[PDB]
Amino acid sequence: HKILHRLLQD
Amino acid sequence: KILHRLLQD
Amino acid sequence: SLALSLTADQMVSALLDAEPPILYSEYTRPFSEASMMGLLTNLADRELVHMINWAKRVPGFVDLTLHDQVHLLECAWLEILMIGLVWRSMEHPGKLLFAPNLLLDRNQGKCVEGMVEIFDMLLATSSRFRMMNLQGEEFVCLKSIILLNSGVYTFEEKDHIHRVLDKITDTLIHLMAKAGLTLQQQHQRLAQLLLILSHIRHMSNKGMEHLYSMKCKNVVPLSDLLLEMLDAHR
Amino acid sequence: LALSLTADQMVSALLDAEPPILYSEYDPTPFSEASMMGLLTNLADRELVHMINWAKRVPGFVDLTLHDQVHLLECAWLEILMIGLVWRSMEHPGKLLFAPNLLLDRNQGKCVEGMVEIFDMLLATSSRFRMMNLQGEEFVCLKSIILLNSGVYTFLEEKDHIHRVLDKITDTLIHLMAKAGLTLQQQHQRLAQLLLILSHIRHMSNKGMEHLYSMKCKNVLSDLLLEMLDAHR
Numbered sequence: 001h002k003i004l005h006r007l008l009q010d
Numbered sequence: 011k012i013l014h015r016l017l018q019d
Numbered sequence: 020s021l022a023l024s025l026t027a028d029q030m031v032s033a034l035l036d037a038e039p040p041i042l043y044s045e046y047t048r049p050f051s052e053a054s055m056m057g058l059l060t061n062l063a064d065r066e067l068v069h070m071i072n073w074a075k076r077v078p079g080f081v082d083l084t085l086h087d088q089v090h091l092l093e094c095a096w097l098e099i100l101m102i103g104l105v106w107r108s109m110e111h112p113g114k115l116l117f118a119p120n121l122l123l124d125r126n127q128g129k130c131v132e133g134m135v136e137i138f139d140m141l142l143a144t145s146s147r148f149r150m151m152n153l154q155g156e157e158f159v160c161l162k163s164i165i166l167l168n169s170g171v172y173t174f175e176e177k178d179h180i181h182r183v184l185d186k187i188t189d190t191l192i193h194l195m196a197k198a199g200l201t202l203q204q205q206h207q208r209l210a211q212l213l214l215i216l217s218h219i220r221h222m223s224n225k226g227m228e229h230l231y232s233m234k235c236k237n238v239v240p241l242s243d244l245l246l247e248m249l250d251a252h253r
Numbered sequence: 254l255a256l257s258l259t260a261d262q263m264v265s266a267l268l269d270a271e272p273p274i275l276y277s278e279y280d281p282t283p284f285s286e287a288s289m290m291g292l293l294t295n296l297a298d299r300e301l302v303h304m305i306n307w308a309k310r311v312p313g314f315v316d317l318t319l320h321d322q323v324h325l326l327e328c329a330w331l332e333i334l335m336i337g338l339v340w341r342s343m344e345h346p347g348k349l350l351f352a353p354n355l356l357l358d359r360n361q362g363k364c365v366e367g368m369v370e371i372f373d374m375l376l377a378t379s380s381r382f383r384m385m386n387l388q389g390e391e392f393v394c395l396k397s398i399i400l401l402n403s404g405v406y407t408f409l410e411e412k413d414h415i416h417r418v419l420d421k422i423t424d425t426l427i428h429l430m431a432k433a434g435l436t437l438q439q440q441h442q443r444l445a446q447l448l449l450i451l452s453h454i455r456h457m458s459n460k461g462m463e464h465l466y467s468m469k470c471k472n473v474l475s476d477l478l479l480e481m482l483d484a485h486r
């Protein structure tokens with residue numbers, strides 16, 4: 001899991 | 011400085 | 020696929036509209052090494068959040084899968100921060116405008132060690148932009164090129180990216196022809212702009228080293244997001 | 254001097270200046286990490302001697318002061334070695350032709366750690382040149398651009414001389430592409446595609462320097478080579 005993943009979907 | 015020399019010719 | 024359809028003019032407007040805002044530094048007393056580092060890593064961390072939302076607004080970037088979007092941002096994030104810093108420092112010769120309330124000269128780069136070298140390289144890029152009279156329309160094209168180019172050769176998905184890169188190239192030429200430049204001046208200026216990206220890449224690699232080294236010697240904690248973008252270059 | 258040149262004479266002058274393809278001491282009688290790396294660094298050291306004399310033939314380079322000639326070479330020497338390796342590897346998919354007797358795939362670049370990553374990057378660059386069907390006349394232009402550009406902003410009227418020559422090389426690339434029958438739109442696009450690759454070559458060189466300085470300390474190896482490094486230290 002990456003924070004970068006989350007910010008790209010939000 | 012080797013490069014200095016090889017450039018000097 | 021919509022990035023392809025756009026006119027040169029629509030590409031410029033779409034990029035200018037995507038532009039992230041100029042953030043402020045937390046500042047205010049004279050700088051120690053650890054305080055200088057703290058202000059910069061705090062600023063970079065907040066800019067990262069805005070860069071990620073700017074990237075999604077770069078035409079054709081949403082058409083990529085999530086895995087590729089992560090890869091391109093992990094590879095280019097410092098380059099993108101640097102070209103932006105260089106851009107907004109154009110009308111401040113000899114100084115780096117990290118933030119409107121954080122304008123630094125190279126003598127203030129001595130506060131942290133090895134910082135001066137990157138400083139002079141960054142000031143040199145800003146002096147190059149100023150000498151070329153880099154336009155804002157050209158700048159936003161270069162920044163998105165960095166985003167799509169820097170990590171493309173470390174992956175059907177390339178073809179799209181390459182087709183978008185060609186579209187941005189057409190946009191650059193279109194801006195120069197609109198500016199009255201002759202055909203020869205157009206491809207010469209196009210080459211001069213893209214060669215600067217080689218130096219921005221160089222500054223980024225040296226910045227990664229400098230960021231990783233003073234990370235292991237632990238003066239200020241880095242945010243987990245910044246720490247993850249940095250660990251991707253290992 | 255260099256501002257004189259015909260677009261066609263620019264090409265032929267660069268083609269004539271091309272250094273030779275050297276051989277390694279590779280004896281296929283497997284190697285080790287130390288031995289395989291010994292061959293590579295031995296080969297790079299001998300290529301440096303030719304690159305220096307090739308740089309003297311690059312138009313406009315001799316017009317530079319000896320201080321700036323050293324600087325441009327100290328910054329670009331590994332970039333120039335890499336683009337040449339990538340160039341002579343175009344016709345060998347999944348393999349790097351370090352020397353006619355030294356052709357390697359990524360599985361053998363594993364012998365040294367972290368070299369696998371640089372190997373894939375060099376292979377990806379070579380595959381990109383093959384996909385674009387890079388021409389030798391375009392290659393010699395790019396290699397000379399690296400020599401004159403990579404160090405230009407680490408260096409007043411001497412800079413403008415370098416940028417004047419760089420502009421002429423840019424004119425040459427366009428001249429070649431228009432001669433190949435490309436539309437004006439296709440020329441600008443191809444010009445951009447070639448120059449963006451130099452950003453990745455710069456990246457491979459930066460990581461190559463790290464892998465290199467690391468084993469200057471690890472201490473498994475040339476005087477001229479150890480001296481090129483400290484400049485990037």
Ligand SMILES: C[C@]12CC[C@@H]3c4ccc(O)cc4CC[C@H]3[C@@H]1C[C@H](Cc1ccccc1)[C@@H]2O
Pocket residue numbers: 055056057059060062063066100101103104117134137226229230231233234
């Ligand atoms: C100063 C710095 C390069 C430039 C970075 C940057 C660029 C644009 C921008 O808008 C914000 C920033 C903030 C981060 C900047 C980098 C930090 C780094 C120096 C450093 C600071 C703290 C610990 C280790 C190393 C490194 O040397």
